[PDB]
Design a protein around this ligand. Structure first.
Ligand SMILES: [Ca+2]
Ligand SMILES: [Ca+2]
Ligand SMILES: [Ca+2]
Ligand SMILES: [Ca+2]
Ligand SMILES: [Ca+2]
Ligand SMILES: [Ca+2]
Ligand SMILES: [Ca+2]
Ligand SMILES: [Ca+2]
Ligand SMILES: [Ca+2]
Ligand SMILES: [Ca+2]
Ligand SMILES: [Ca+2]
Ligand SMILES: [Ca+2]
Ligand SMILES: [Ca+2]
Ligand SMILES: [Ca+2]
Ligand SMILES: [Ca+2]
Ligand SMILES: [Ca+2]
Ligand SMILES: [Ca+2]
Ligand SMILES: [Ca+2]
Ligand SMILES: [Ca+2]
Ligand SMILES: [Ca+2]
Ligand SMILES: [Ca+2]
Ligand SMILES: [Ca+2]
Ligand SMILES: [Ca+2]
Ligand SMILES: [Ca+2]
Ligand SMILES: [Ca+2]
Ligand SMILES: [Ca+2]
Ligand SMILES: [Ca+2]
Lengths: 353, 354
């Protein structure tokens, strides 16, 4: 047991209501402060089981992260509407994390381990250096998220400081990389002060134009390319992604990456997303069921599919109505051309929910 | 919300005490039955509640898996000592999962999502087929666990049936793969009815000798090669692995695989593992801190290390005393030869916790 003991809540009240009186003092009490902006719970007792148990989730995270200077608080959308408005808490059930001069919206799975992992990521520095062949291979292994890398001459470079300033705008959701090593820059085809932007799952980057780049030019570029043609659903941002629907629907692909059949389907999906990456109307959410075991039976029931096999369909975010590509079984996968044809009919509305 | 709605516990009592009077019926009710074998909780209310929250974890899992034929129950080590002995429940705080003729011990993180993911793995078939080049790439992509692959003529082969019987013995912890595809077999260098065993993180397999292989020969081989030179700690088996030290210590390497610094260290670690894989006294636990976020502050405090940098150290399993390889910072990583020398000093006893 010694060397491996999960923490058990100790009953100490660490998460309290944050109101117009105490909010100035709460902030001075923590290096990083995360505020859950919530609606007052319903008068019925069944909604209290959901509210108390989720405050206890924040209490566990508060306990785990105490010695790292993190604190958690609750902000009532009615009782505290005034202070909420001044702090910038506008989305009910989001958790706003305050680090330095940035406000980070958490809109992901409400679970202690996922919240703690997210705060640990927030506490890290917003730029990761790349030096040498091994660290470069590490950068190149990243595919399931947007990434940026820039080539500068040193930490003191004025353009590096603008890169770091832009990095803080998207922390911790978009990893920003910098290299001062010319051999790395050579392999990446980076001229000095050039910044390459890699859309998730794309092998070919786009250089931000008009080098060198100020913070404003980077922030503007990223905001314009924020939605990848193929996105992976991730627990830490699952509701942010799900709320970003394409005119009422999502195209959802289920594939277990480690399974031979899921891998085979996933390769086809990546290849089709790469070949159609310039289509502005095309977005696909890849869900690996192994990332969301507690939702697998729900999904199988709601969608009437077998998640032991790869699937792709259209999901309506209003009522969870759905239509799925017909496959005989896990061996009956579509070719890249059959997948494109199905995606084309979906986008033309010929395959509707 | 809609299409992305996590289940919340509904209050229905699905997990009950399983005892001499009802166990035969509980077993008959469920296709797959998971039994938590636990001591009676202490008389105070603090441990009485920690026991209730663990039962609520099983209640959520039971609710989520109800339609898949899975049930959960609780067996008291004192009140139900007799039925525990009858069923083979011996390790307090383990959960025993009954599928067909097998009894599968769960000794991993006690949380609803890890337990549900585990049971979903239990429900899967014990042998995965490989056909075609892309499924072969998927097989070759597996590295962080032991794996076996055999080449057979079809499922009607006696040797396939022996292989699937052996697979059931280790399900779901060691993935067994079968191919009937002679082109895949040629690419793997498998003769018909041969079985190759891949130790975790090793490029080159070991062929099980004395082809063709009975169930007993496969099981015996796997048991003798159960302990990889480099083993990744996983939530589903974390306590099983931690309780499996050889001599009183674990060599523990912390490395975040996705981080450039962790990756650089990890590649060195794998190289040293592969070069020293025949040393029977060498075994290293690789912990990726991102798999265990709720333990990261505790590890940092207990071990006096910074887990945003890679680390390797010796941990005594009796008193948690530890000693860590000294590194100036995350760039001061050892070479393969310096790691070897450090590991050699550990196994010689020069570097020790005492
Ligand atoms: Ca509280
Ligand atoms: Ca939201
Ligand atoms: Ca989890
Ligand atoms: Ca992390
Ligand atoms: Ca700055
Ligand atoms: Ca991140
Ligand atoms: Ca270029
Ligand atoms: Ca410019
Ligand atoms: Ca949001
Ligand atoms: Ca499969
Ligand atoms: Ca298959
Ligand atoms: Ca695109
Ligand atoms: Ca998982
Ligand atoms: Ca296939
Ligand atoms: Ca119960
Ligand atoms: Ca145990
Ligand atoms: Ca699984
Ligand atoms: Ca059999
Ligand atoms: Ca498994
Ligand atoms: Ca061979
Ligand atoms: Ca034989
Ligand atoms: Ca055990
Ligand atoms: Ca790093
Ligand atoms: Ca580095
Ligand atoms: Ca070995
Ligand atoms: Ca993680
Ligand atoms: Ca380095």
């Amino acid at each position: 047991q010694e060397g491996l003991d999960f923490p058990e809540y100790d009953g100490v009240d660490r998460v309290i209501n944050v109101n117009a009186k105490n909010y100035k003092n709460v902030f001075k009490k923590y290096e990083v402060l995360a505020l859950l902006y919530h609606e007052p719970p319903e008068d019925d007792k069944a909604s209290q089981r959901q509210f108390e148990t989720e405050e206890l989730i924040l209490e566990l995270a508060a306990q785990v992260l105490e010695d790292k200077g993190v604190g958690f608080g609750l902000v009532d959308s009615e009782k505290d509407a005034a202070v909420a408005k001044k702090l910038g808490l506008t989305e009910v059930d989001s958790m706003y994390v305050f680090k330095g001069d940035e406000v980070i919206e958490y809109d992901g799975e409400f679970s202690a381990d996922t919240i703690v992992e997210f705060l640990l990521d927030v506490l890290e520095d917003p730029v990761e250096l790349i030096e040498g062949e091994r660290e470069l291979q590490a950068f190149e292994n990243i595919e399931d998220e947007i990434k940026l890398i820039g080539y500068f001459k040193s930490k003191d470079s004025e353009h590096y400081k603008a890169f770091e300033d832009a990095a803080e705008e998207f922390h911790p959701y978009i990893p920003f990389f910098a290299t001062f090593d010319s051999k790395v820059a050579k392999k990446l085809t980076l001229k000095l002060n050039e910044i390459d932007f890699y859309e998730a799952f794309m092998e070919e980057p786009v250089t931000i134009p008009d080098k060198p780049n100020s913070e404003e030019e980077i922030v503007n570029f990223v905001e314009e390319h924020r939605r990848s043609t193929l996105r992976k659903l991730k627990p830490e941002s699952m509701y942010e992604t799900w709320e970003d629907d394409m005119d009422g629907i999502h195209i959802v692909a289920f594939a277990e990456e480690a399974d031979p059949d899921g891998f085979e389907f996933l390769e086809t999906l990546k290849a089709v997303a790469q070949d159609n990456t310039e289509n502005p109307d095309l977005s696909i959410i890849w869900i690996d069921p192994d990332d969301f075991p507690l939702l697998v039976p729900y999904w199988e029931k709601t969608f009437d599919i077998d998640l032991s096999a790869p699937q792709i369909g259209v999901v309506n975010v209003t009522d969870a109505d759905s239509v799925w590509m017909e496959m005989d079984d896990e061996e009956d996968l579509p070719s890249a051309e059959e997948l494109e044809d199905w995606l084309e009919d979906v986008l033309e509305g010929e395959i509707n929910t």
